[PDB]
């Protein structure tokens, strides 16, 4: 397992420090499940899909960290320390739960480490495959020669590889369609300007960066043919939690009769919730808002709010692109079909 | 004439360097009509209202710069050099035109300089007064104990003093109403986080700064009672041109049944245009987007778009707060009444 986002050295997990791009391309080596937790918590690694696989490995390292007392209790704490990092994206729990299950069924096997590491590996290789499929299904919805607006970074850096929303793009381009992407810088973290822009230019795909308060006007001016974004948590309802600001675009998209698509793997669909009001919303540190890449921009001692995600009601979504097909209204009715 | 935004030393114009706040509070001295132009062009001074008075003074300096040839041709050029700075805000032309008229009628007067400078001063003293009236008229629309979202900086630093949209706030507070403001940082320039936050904290008014992609969700969550912003150019139609991102707020406001108010002096209403499609929209340098206040944030050699304003159709505006009253639908019909 070796890609731009992460690399598995058998006994450690290397993560591209996404909080340092687009200028610095260094890596962070995680050796302790606590470090992977830290890398996730600090957003060194990020993007629902990639948080899971990365979480799965930190779990494997979790075993390699074991020393005394009960193995079960300790593996339970490793899982708890990793899950306690970031709320919203359900991929994290989905990964952890899948891994813990393997564990409970091989805890007595002497080749435990080999077995667990194997699933994590099996998992990463599936994400890239799942993504290329999402890209393929989404491509058919993108008419040649169009301008697609995106949000956050639902691409290579947000997954093991290829990406979800950006995967749909790479696939349309691969099919041979002239395409250009308007990418919101997406503050405060600036995934758009620092990550999406970067991996897209590095792939030879036409890219423009715009401030978040621009998307609206540009849609009204008729420069955007479609809006495609990723997700962190989709409910049985179809409501999807994604990077703060995704909701507003959805609203603006309806007002300008512009298709709004959510590209995400089935693993992002939380089967335990009915609607989007049940999705936990992460609140991050005040620094992210008062600063911008290092420098403080707001006055000293100012109050702020910092939700990292918002929720878009399903009625504002045209369709959900999955590795198993394009889901359309009635969502609750169709998602239930795909789930099985 | 002495306020935080600008000061008239009789033979030079001192402008608070708004592109350095909230940390550095230095001033820039303009002695040539060209320097005032430069200050305007670079946004050392900014905010429709303040751009006018500042332009009016750079005009008197224009006379002070006179040396040879025809006095009329030179003053015409001074006016042209000053008007060629920033497109959108009509306050600039309104000011320049008012000043040139005074000039044309006193050109042969021995006390020309004293006369022209006198109008400029008379103009500054009127703006502050006009604002306090806008503030008062708007205060009545704000219910005690409410949370108000603003955009850009339509406050003290955008006018000679007091401000327009923020004037409405200062006034509601003066009346004795518990009030707090959610101020969008407003990228790329960050007028919100750097200016609105600053002058509001310095006035002892509860303030929170949020990234632009947040307003939408926060409105849906029910934390915002009303949205009040300023304007750069309002048409007879009622459509108003304001800082890029204002249009989206208006849209998000309608969706969440939230009052949207535009506070601006009559001098911002352009009488020569019928609708908002006739408003010129300024496009500024790409650096403003690829950089954030100081450091480069986007990849080297990336494409971007940079509109400095967008247009909000009148049908999305609840009312326009003026020093002459609260204008309501039918705008075209009512605005025609306020003008006469
Ligand atoms: Cl709807
Ligand atoms: Cl409407």
XYZ file of C-alpha atoms and ligand atoms in Angstrom:
682
model
C 0.000 0.000 0.000
C 1.613 3.218 -1.242
C -0.113 6.377 -2.516
C 0.133 10.154 -2.080
C -2.182 10.227 0.947
C -0.715 7.341 2.933
C 1.802 4.512 2.941
C 1.929 1.301 4.983
C 5.474 0.304 5.965
C 4.214 -2.841 7.674
C 5.029 -1.447 11.100
C 4.129 2.237 10.677
C 1.714 4.473 8.762
C 3.079 7.343 6.698
C 0.626 10.175 6.086
C 1.089 13.119 3.754
C 0.828 16.130 6.069
C -2.220 17.703 4.447
C -2.008 20.683 6.790
C 1.192 21.730 5.022
C 0.229 21.599 1.337
C 0.293 22.888 -1.378
C 3.871 24.098 -0.903
C 5.344 21.468 1.437
C 5.040 17.800 0.462
C 6.402 16.110 3.606
C 5.136 12.997 5.412
C 4.310 12.063 9.001
C 5.217 8.626 10.348
C 2.738 7.164 12.805
C 3.961 4.245 14.904
C 1.550 4.315 17.831
C -2.225 4.082 17.618
C -2.093 7.305 19.622
C -0.136 9.008 16.870
C -2.630 7.960 14.199
C -5.304 9.332 16.511
C -3.310 12.543 16.770
C -2.787 12.722 13.000
C -6.539 12.348 12.540
C -7.422 14.802 15.304
C -5.073 17.470 13.889
C -6.209 16.857 10.326
C -2.728 15.778 9.180
C -4.822 13.227 7.344
C -8.448 13.965 6.511
C -11.395 13.319 4.256
C -14.009 10.828 5.459
C -12.828 7.888 3.302
C -9.159 8.367 4.211
C -9.831 8.846 7.917
C -11.254 5.334 8.036
C -8.477 3.391 6.335
C -5.973 5.450 8.302
C -7.998 4.643 11.418
C -7.992 0.963 10.523
C -4.200 0.950 10.461
C -3.836 2.832 13.725
C -5.900 -0.028 15.088
C -3.390 -2.551 13.736
C -0.620 -0.528 15.325
C -2.822 -0.609 18.409
C -2.016 -4.292 18.751
C 1.685 -3.646 18.213
C 1.357 -1.279 21.199
C -0.040 -3.958 23.510
C 2.116 -4.942 26.468
C 0.229 -6.072 29.577
C -3.221 -6.720 31.053
C -6.157 -8.029 29.014
C -5.777 -7.812 25.233
C -9.512 -7.249 24.757
C -9.766 -4.332 27.208
C -6.745 -2.692 25.600
C -7.954 -3.164 22.017
C -11.243 -1.681 23.240
C -9.370 1.400 24.444
C -7.368 1.671 21.237
C -10.616 1.664 19.297
C -12.084 4.189 21.705
C -9.094 6.523 21.462
C -9.251 6.457 17.664
C -13.035 6.917 17.439
C -12.897 9.836 19.867
C -10.866 11.904 17.383
C -13.474 13.353 14.985
C -17.349 13.049 15.266
C -19.080 13.661 11.938
C -17.569 11.293 9.363
C -19.114 7.857 9.923
C -16.479 6.173 7.778
C -14.248 6.239 10.865
C -16.630 4.131 12.945
C -17.459 1.926 9.972
C -13.755 1.157 9.601
C -13.164 0.671 13.319
C -16.215 -1.566 13.683
C -15.177 -3.728 10.732
C -11.664 -4.101 12.161
C -12.822 -4.875 15.693
C -15.021 -7.619 14.277
C -12.074 -9.303 12.586
C -10.186 -9.022 15.877
C -12.888 -10.700 17.983
C -12.792 -13.644 15.589
C -9.024 -14.159 15.582
C -7.950 -12.903 19.002
C -6.724 -16.443 19.723
C -4.922 -16.823 16.389
C -1.135 -16.480 16.683
C -1.099 -14.722 13.322
C -3.365 -11.979 14.691
C -1.215 -9.050 13.561
C -0.909 -10.533 10.085
C -4.673 -11.034 9.932
C -5.634 -7.547 11.126
C -3.041 -5.807 8.965
C -4.455 -7.883 6.127
C -7.972 -6.465 6.455
C -6.651 -2.907 6.659
C -4.748 -3.666 3.467
C -7.795 -5.332 1.947
C -9.718 -2.234 2.972
C -7.415 0.331 1.370
C -7.351 -1.611 -1.902
C -11.148 -1.591 -1.852
C -11.507 2.150 -1.307
C -9.524 2.963 -4.432
C -11.597 0.417 -6.332
C -14.842 1.721 -4.837
C -13.870 5.261 -5.825
C -13.021 4.519 -9.458
C -16.523 3.029 -9.601
C -18.136 6.166 -8.143
C -16.216 8.214 -10.667
C -17.496 5.964 -13.437
C -21.139 6.251 -12.379
C -20.890 10.025 -11.978
C -19.213 10.669 -15.333
C -22.405 9.804 -17.222
C -24.105 12.712 -15.460
C -21.480 15.245 -16.606
C -22.104 16.619 -20.111
C -18.920 17.138 -22.116
C -17.490 20.649 -22.027
C -19.051 21.726 -18.731
C -17.916 23.678 -15.673
C -18.348 21.874 -12.367
C -18.146 23.598 -9.001
C -16.871 21.645 -5.999
C -16.412 22.182 -2.285
C -13.773 20.982 0.174
C -11.546 18.187 -1.110
C -13.343 14.976 -1.991
C -10.489 13.721 -4.100
C -7.179 11.910 -3.962
C -6.131 13.445 -0.649
C -9.489 12.613 0.942
C -9.274 8.915 0.063
C -6.727 6.153 -0.417
C -6.633 7.376 -4.020
C -8.600 8.634 -7.043
C -11.201 10.350 -4.883
C -14.994 10.545 -4.868
C -16.283 13.844 -6.289
C -12.944 14.497 -7.985
C -12.998 10.856 -9.036
C -16.156 11.567 -10.991
C -14.189 14.388 -12.625
C -11.048 12.404 -13.449
C -13.316 9.771 -14.999
C -15.192 12.255 -17.176
C -11.844 13.614 -18.346
C -10.572 10.084 -18.924
C -13.625 9.421 -21.073
C -12.329 12.388 -23.041
C -14.567 15.256 -21.972
C -13.347 18.846 -21.869
C -13.819 19.828 -18.243
C -12.828 22.557 -15.806
C -13.522 22.807 -12.090
C -14.380 25.849 -10.036
C -13.072 24.932 -6.588
C -14.071 26.918 -3.507
C -10.980 27.495 -1.359
C -13.269 26.378 1.450
C -12.313 28.182 4.639
C -11.187 28.052 7.332
C -8.894 25.043 6.661
C -8.766 25.832 2.945
C -9.049 22.293 1.580
C -10.097 23.705 -1.786
C -7.267 26.133 -2.439
C -4.610 23.970 -0.773
C -5.694 20.440 -1.631
C -8.253 20.249 -4.433
C -6.405 22.831 -6.553
C -3.092 21.049 -6.019
C -4.063 17.465 -6.862
C -6.077 18.699 -9.823
C -3.264 20.745 -11.354
C -0.937 17.825 -10.715
C -3.301 15.702 -12.827
C -3.549 18.146 -15.696
C -7.170 19.146 -15.093
C -8.354 22.730 -15.696
C -8.796 24.424 -12.318
C -9.935 27.756 -10.914
C -9.991 28.749 -7.260
C -12.646 31.152 -6.001
C -13.486 32.487 -2.535
C -16.507 30.837 -0.923
C -18.697 33.939 -1.126
C -18.386 33.725 -4.930
C -20.090 30.451 -5.888
C -23.515 32.025 -5.491
C -23.036 34.892 -7.931
C -21.201 32.727 -10.469
C -24.121 30.296 -10.475
C -26.482 33.200 -11.130
C -24.221 34.388 -13.922
C -24.589 30.954 -15.525
C -20.948 29.861 -15.471
C -21.575 26.679 -13.505
C -23.266 23.711 -15.177
C -23.312 21.489 -12.112
C -22.256 21.241 -8.490
C -20.657 17.977 -7.366
C -19.352 17.443 -3.826
C -18.470 14.626 -1.463
C -19.988 13.804 1.921
C -19.098 12.704 5.453
C -22.384 11.215 6.595
C -25.527 10.416 4.623
C -28.638 9.280 6.485
C -31.252 6.734 5.373
C -33.197 9.920 4.682
C -30.690 10.974 2.064
C -29.758 14.094 4.030
C -25.991 14.398 3.823
C -23.512 15.989 6.211
C -20.546 17.586 4.455
C -17.989 20.385 4.779
C -19.560 23.516 6.241
C -20.801 25.591 3.318
C -22.136 22.630 1.328
C -25.665 23.406 2.495
C -25.591 26.975 1.173
C -24.393 25.797 -2.236
C -27.307 23.330 -2.299
C -29.682 26.202 -1.601
C -28.045 28.447 -4.218
C -28.160 25.541 -6.666
C -31.934 25.194 -6.349
C -32.414 28.928 -6.806
C -30.485 28.799 -10.096
C -31.872 25.454 -11.283
C -28.467 23.827 -11.126
C -27.947 20.074 -10.564
C -26.501 19.323 -7.111
C -24.747 15.950 -6.783
C -23.316 14.169 -3.763
C -20.562 11.656 -4.597
C -19.823 9.196 -1.800
C -19.214 5.500 -1.179
C -21.923 3.409 0.487
C -19.699 3.289 3.586
C -20.575 6.928 4.169
C -24.250 6.047 4.571
C -25.018 5.677 8.292
C -27.645 2.872 8.547
C -28.507 3.687 12.160
C -30.065 7.102 11.535
C -33.253 8.144 9.807
C -32.689 11.842 9.092
C -29.895 14.403 9.019
C -30.771 15.909 12.392
C -29.208 12.839 13.994
C -25.751 13.570 12.521
C -23.176 14.844 15.043
C -21.582 18.112 13.932
C -17.936 18.708 14.825
C -16.926 22.023 16.393
C -13.224 22.720 16.016
C -10.752 25.119 17.632
C -11.286 28.917 17.421
C -7.791 29.353 15.951
C -8.869 27.959 12.577
C -11.154 30.972 12.146
C -9.038 33.734 13.675
C -5.987 32.620 11.658
C -5.378 31.698 8.028
C -2.387 29.505 7.321
C -0.434 30.864 10.257
C -1.190 34.551 10.622
C -3.920 35.833 12.906
C -6.424 37.774 10.795
C -9.069 38.718 13.350
C -8.604 41.031 16.358
C -7.113 39.649 19.557
C -9.740 38.182 21.886
C -12.576 37.957 19.358
C -15.440 35.484 19.665
C -16.206 33.057 16.869
C -18.093 29.925 15.927
C -16.560 27.062 13.995
C -18.793 24.235 12.758
C -16.812 21.913 10.495
C -19.875 20.563 8.677
C -23.494 21.426 7.897
C -26.419 19.270 6.805
C -28.201 19.359 3.468
C -31.786 18.081 3.446
C -32.321 15.422 0.787
C -34.914 17.519 -1.036
C -32.111 19.819 -2.204
C -30.093 16.966 -3.693
C -30.525 15.832 -7.275
C -28.804 12.494 -6.768
C -26.253 10.533 -4.795
C -23.421 8.902 -6.752
C -22.441 5.492 -5.418
C -20.117 2.670 -6.459
C -23.364 0.739 -6.762
C -25.292 3.245 -8.835
C -26.897 6.678 -8.972
C -29.516 7.045 -6.248
C -32.444 9.371 -6.923
C -35.687 10.339 -5.133
C -37.341 8.692 -3.250
C -34.052 8.442 -1.332
C -35.298 6.691 1.803
C -36.943 4.202 -0.533
C -34.014 3.674 -2.892
C -31.163 3.837 -0.377
C -32.854 0.976 1.468
C -32.624 -1.024 -1.776
C -28.922 -0.355 -2.335
C -27.997 -1.003 1.306
C -28.947 -4.683 1.072
C -12.357 67.167 9.899
C -10.914 64.397 12.085
C -12.208 60.834 12.465
C -10.761 57.313 12.486
C -11.185 56.820 8.726
C -9.715 60.110 7.528
C -8.387 63.521 8.488
C -8.074 66.765 6.525
C -4.936 68.786 7.300
C -5.984 71.551 4.922
C -3.297 70.711 2.385
C -3.248 66.905 2.579
C -5.556 63.969 3.305
C -4.651 61.422 5.982
C -6.273 58.014 5.541
C -6.287 55.171 8.038
C -4.526 52.392 6.136
C -7.425 49.942 6.166
C -5.299 47.306 4.453
C -3.201 46.958 7.607
C -5.807 46.641 10.365
C -6.734 45.223 12.824
C -3.186 45.051 14.186
C -1.492 48.144 12.744
C -3.269 51.486 13.109
C -1.106 53.705 10.886
C -2.143 56.520 8.542
C -1.265 57.429 4.957
C -0.795 61.049 3.884
C -2.057 62.020 0.440
C -0.855 65.326 -1.004
C -1.495 64.789 -4.700
C -4.807 63.965 -6.356
C -2.843 60.987 -7.684
C -2.001 59.708 -4.221
C -5.652 59.872 -3.186
C -6.368 57.981 -6.379
C -3.723 55.418 -5.512
C -5.090 55.115 -1.973
C -8.543 54.480 -3.419
C -7.280 52.053 -6.044
C -5.286 50.024 -3.480
C -8.098 50.101 -0.940
C -6.048 51.992 1.667
C -9.393 53.687 2.103
C -12.608 51.966 1.078
C -16.328 51.696 1.592
C -18.575 53.429 -0.945
C -19.419 56.366 1.353
C -15.813 57.026 2.383
C -14.482 56.610 -1.147
C -16.568 59.616 -2.130
C -15.507 62.116 0.515
C -11.949 60.899 0.092
C -12.321 61.436 -3.650
C -13.782 64.892 -3.072
C -10.687 65.921 -1.131
C -8.268 64.422 -3.622
C -10.076 66.713 -6.012
C -9.186 69.884 -4.094
C -5.611 68.668 -3.913
C -6.068 68.360 -7.657
C -6.274 72.139 -7.771
C -3.274 72.404 -5.460
C -1.437 70.291 -8.065
C -2.228 72.711 -10.884
C 0.734 74.420 -12.521
C 0.328 75.221 -16.223
C -1.933 74.978 -19.275
C -5.721 75.270 -19.087
C -7.181 74.953 -15.589
C -10.363 73.353 -16.922
C -8.580 70.615 -18.902
C -6.419 69.747 -15.893
C -9.307 69.630 -13.403
C -11.170 67.454 -15.924
C -8.204 65.072 -15.922
C -7.905 65.113 -12.139
C -11.550 64.103 -12.020
C -10.921 61.469 -14.667
C -7.885 60.010 -12.887
C -9.834 59.821 -9.634
C -12.954 58.314 -11.235
C -10.914 55.688 -13.074
C -9.953 54.021 -9.766
C -12.908 51.800 -8.783
C -16.060 51.118 -10.957
C -18.909 49.835 -8.810
C -19.563 52.302 -5.989
C -21.488 55.267 -7.420
C -20.707 57.417 -4.385
C -17.395 58.218 -6.088
C -18.970 59.735 -9.202
C -21.717 61.369 -7.167
C -19.018 63.101 -5.135
C -16.811 63.983 -8.095
C -19.779 65.375 -10.008
C -20.922 67.491 -7.071
C -17.392 68.882 -6.681
C -16.900 69.631 -10.364
C -20.164 71.553 -10.423
C -19.011 73.776 -7.576
C -15.765 74.237 -9.499
C -17.423 75.209 -12.796
C -19.330 77.927 -10.966
C -16.380 79.373 -9.043
C -13.477 78.792 -11.427
C -12.843 82.547 -11.732
C -13.119 83.112 -7.975
C -9.885 84.189 -6.254
C -10.919 81.964 -3.352
C -11.413 78.867 -5.511
C -9.376 76.571 -3.259
C -11.182 77.828 -0.168
C -14.521 77.285 -1.906
C -13.845 73.769 -3.194
C -12.278 72.553 0.042
C -15.299 74.020 1.791
C -17.718 71.776 -0.106
C -15.619 68.706 0.650
C -15.731 69.541 4.351
C -19.431 70.302 4.005
C -19.723 66.895 2.379
C -17.905 64.998 5.123
C -19.996 66.625 7.854
C -23.120 65.619 5.951
C -22.138 61.979 5.538
C -21.700 61.489 9.271
C -25.050 63.178 9.841
C -26.745 61.201 7.059
C -25.466 57.984 8.625
C -26.795 58.661 12.126
C -30.184 59.126 10.460
C -29.884 55.789 8.646
C -28.886 54.206 11.927
C -31.939 55.667 13.639
C -34.359 54.699 10.870
C -33.025 51.137 10.888
C -32.988 50.763 14.669
C -36.790 50.576 14.640
C -36.623 47.394 12.544
C -34.315 45.617 15.022
C -36.061 43.829 17.906
C -34.277 43.977 21.266
C -32.053 41.026 22.104
C -31.540 39.849 18.528
C -28.600 38.402 16.608
C -27.779 40.242 13.418
C -25.586 39.029 10.597
C -23.612 41.538 8.538
C -21.287 41.292 5.552
C -18.229 43.302 4.532
C -17.733 46.497 6.527
C -20.492 49.062 6.136
C -19.448 50.763 9.327
C -17.284 53.543 10.694
C -14.343 52.625 8.460
C -16.581 52.620 5.375
C -17.840 56.156 5.960
C -16.622 59.462 7.349
C -17.902 58.070 10.647
C -20.658 56.141 12.470
C -21.317 53.899 9.478
C -24.442 52.695 7.677
C -25.387 49.076 8.469
C -23.240 49.230 11.608
C -24.753 52.642 12.272
C -28.128 50.941 12.439
C -26.539 48.690 15.065
C -24.763 51.357 17.110
C -28.114 53.152 17.189
C -30.115 50.128 18.333
C -27.529 49.674 21.073
C -27.712 53.352 21.993
C -31.474 52.989 22.319
C -30.594 50.353 24.899
C -31.102 47.068 23.082
C -29.068 43.972 23.876
C -27.438 43.195 20.543
C -24.686 41.025 19.101
C -23.399 40.753 15.548
C -22.270 37.794 13.493
C -19.779 39.309 11.063
C -18.713 37.306 8.018
C -14.935 37.662 7.654
C -15.712 38.347 4.008
C -12.888 37.096 1.832
C -10.688 37.730 0.030
C -9.908 41.172 1.562
C -11.420 40.202 4.920
C -13.208 43.476 5.646
C -15.312 41.589 8.179
C -12.670 39.946 10.337
C -10.214 42.847 9.998
C -12.493 45.877 10.098
C -16.048 45.192 11.245
C -14.810 43.068 14.154
C -12.272 45.737 15.096
C -14.453 48.847 15.142
C -17.235 46.895 16.814
C -15.066 45.608 19.656
C -13.592 49.074 20.053
C -17.167 50.301 20.525
C -18.069 47.690 23.104
C -20.569 45.833 20.932
C -20.870 42.032 21.182
C -19.218 40.490 18.112
C -18.571 37.096 16.566
C -16.589 36.438 13.404
C -17.504 33.483 11.207
C -16.157 32.242 7.864
C -18.404 33.123 4.927
C -19.425 29.526 4.230
C -21.088 29.510 7.674
C -23.868 32.115 7.410
C -26.142 29.732 5.531
C -26.098 26.926 8.083
C -26.322 29.344 11.016
C -29.448 30.865 9.473
C -30.973 27.405 9.109
C -30.102 26.685 12.723
C -32.102 29.724 13.839
C -29.288 31.762 15.379
C -29.767 34.762 13.101
C -32.771 37.042 13.519
C -31.980 39.395 10.664
C -29.397 40.228 8.041
C -28.382 43.860 7.574
C -25.744 44.973 5.065
C -24.634 48.078 3.229
C -24.477 48.730 -0.506
C -22.260 50.255 -3.202
C -24.877 50.941 -5.861
C -28.666 50.704 -5.796
C -30.704 51.030 -8.997
C -34.105 52.701 -9.449
C -35.245 49.082 -9.595
C -34.148 48.556 -6.020
C -31.547 45.961 -7.006
C -28.414 46.672 -5.016
C -24.751 45.998 -5.728
C -22.724 45.073 -2.648
C -19.636 43.122 -1.592
C -19.395 39.769 -3.341
C -21.290 37.270 -1.201
C -24.223 39.577 -0.427
C -26.380 37.981 -3.102
C -25.945 34.523 -1.563
C -26.921 35.794 1.887
C -30.100 37.267 0.360
C -30.885 33.898 -1.198
C -30.167 32.023 2.050
C -32.271 34.626 3.854
C -35.360 33.963 1.741
C -34.995 30.211 2.214
C -35.023 30.606 6.011
C -37.651 33.349 6.054
C -35.193 35.846 7.491
C -35.471 39.646 7.015
C -32.802 41.014 4.660
C -32.035 44.741 4.942
C -29.914 47.075 2.841
C -28.761 50.200 4.694
C -27.414 52.969 2.482
C -27.604 56.720 1.957
C -29.619 58.095 -0.960
C -26.279 59.049 -2.504
C -25.799 55.355 -3.224
C -28.920 55.188 -5.386
C -27.818 55.656 -9.014
C -30.640 57.597 -10.795
C -29.349 56.851 -14.299
C -29.984 53.097 -14.213
C -33.217 51.139 -14.222
C -32.118 47.703 -12.999
C -29.184 45.904 -11.412
C -27.844 44.555 -14.696
C -26.603 48.050 -15.522
C -24.208 48.124 -12.535
C -20.505 47.792 -13.417
C -18.829 44.990 -11.475
C -15.198 45.462 -10.463
C -12.689 42.674 -11.058
C -9.598 42.976 -8.893
C -6.126 41.427 -8.986
C -5.738 37.613 -8.725
C -3.343 38.037 -5.787
C -6.252 38.835 -3.470
C -7.519 35.274 -3.921
C -4.304 33.254 -4.118
C -3.052 35.027 -0.969
C -4.729 35.620 2.380
C -3.793 38.952 3.859
C -0.132 38.102 3.353
C 0.905 34.544 2.533
C 0.157 32.679 -0.678
C -2.390 29.938 0.005
C -3.106 28.507 -3.440
C -0.705 26.594 -5.720
C 1.695 28.611 -7.857
C 0.267 29.466 -11.278
C -3.401 28.750 -10.525
C -6.332 30.377 -12.291
C -8.925 32.309 -10.332
C -11.805 34.738 -10.681
C -12.189 37.782 -8.482
C -15.412 39.793 -8.629
C -15.482 42.401 -5.873
C -19.277 42.737 -5.883
C -22.431 40.832 -6.843
C -25.983 42.045 -7.475
C -29.064 41.222 -5.426
C -32.430 41.495 -7.202
C -34.864 43.750 -5.371
C -37.361 40.928 -4.891
C -35.010 39.430 -2.304
C -34.758 42.648 -0.299
C -37.129 43.334 2.580
C -36.316 47.031 2.733
C -33.770 49.731 2.062
C -32.838 51.870 5.070
C -32.258 55.489 4.144
C -31.639 58.782 5.936
C -35.034 59.694 4.521
C -36.923 56.595 5.582
C -37.393 52.853 5.225
C -38.160 52.087 1.590
C -40.321 49.037 0.899
C -41.920 47.327 -2.132
C -42.803 48.544 -4.717
C -39.197 49.795 -4.788
C -39.228 51.417 -8.233
C -42.385 53.281 -7.253
C -41.237 54.276 -3.781
C -37.612 55.069 -4.614
C -38.952 57.475 -7.226
C -40.790 59.192 -4.349
C -37.735 59.528 -2.110
C -35.684 60.952 -4.988
C -38.135 63.733 -5.895
Cl -37.290 22.081 -1.249
Cl -38.156 35.761 -5.502
